[PDB]
């Protein structure tokens, strides 16, 4: 999930785009 | 664009930055 | 609680404080 | 909707609860 | 309304959200 | 105190109202 | 330091950075 | 007071120190 | 990404999300 | 410069990358 | 002025507060 | 560096002035 991808691991803005409508 | 730890309020602020007027869903489970 | 005047990222902050790790939807129209 | 209302008018934390998951 | 850990700056931002123009006291000791 | 109640333990907005003027 | 123009939650943030865990009073008139 | 001043005018971090506990 | 309207401290927040611990320069003209 | 542009106009996250170290 | 731990986004927000229109450099290495 | 001075150790606003232009 987003927490695993971005908070516990690391992400940049491209992965965050996955959660936009 | 750097990859970094984004958690909690900082994570939803980043979603706002990237998504803006498109909206987003924050569903950490 | 006091009523709210919340624009931009301030609304997102408020949704996080109301919902937290339950998650939420930020849905402009 | 809520996003517009909170910015042009005022809104309640009670209204914001309807947007939780 | 979710119960969550609210610390430091995030805690006083939440006090601002709830209290607003009433004002508040932040006295952690 | 507020740190114990809200930061080390957990609180929601109702407990925070205790610290409003 | 530079002078400040601080409205809403930005003033609270500034009080936290000046005072910290000493605590502070946010007191609109 | 300070809250008004900082928003309608300008204010100093030195003034803010008078509001610490 | 969406285009940005960023004033004051919001620009700094955005630079941190773009650059992170790489660092950055905040350089008004 | 960028600081002015982002506030009076609009700006891109792509532009912001030119300010990293 | 209190001495405190200022990290990440909170550290660059504090640099904004102190430096403002002078600008700043955030170069953590 | 600034991380050592201000994040791992502690600093106040006077030390932060060192990183202004
Ligand atoms: Zn703001
Ligand atoms: Zn934080």
Author numbering:
A (entry chain G), D (entry chain I), F (entry chain G), H (entry chain I), J (entry chain I), L (entry chain G): 1 to 21
B (entry chain B), C (entry chain D), E (entry chain B), G (entry chain D), I (entry chain D), K (entry chain B): 1 to 29
Excerpt from the publication:
Insulin glulisine (IGlu) is a rapid-acting insulin analogue, which differs from human insulin, where the asparagine at position B3 is replaced by lysine and lysine in position B29 is replaced by glutamic acid. IGlu, like human insulin, is formed of two chains, stabilised with two inter-chain, and one intra-chain, disulfide bridges, commonly referred to as A and B1. IGlu, the recombinant human insulin analogue, has been reported to reduce the propensity to form hexamers (a stable, but ineffective form) and remain as monomers (the effective form), thereby making it a fast-acting analogue. The structural changes of IGlu, namely the replacement of the amino acid asparagine at position B3 by lysine and the replacement of lysine in position B29 by glutamic acid, are what effects the rapid-acting nature of this insulin.
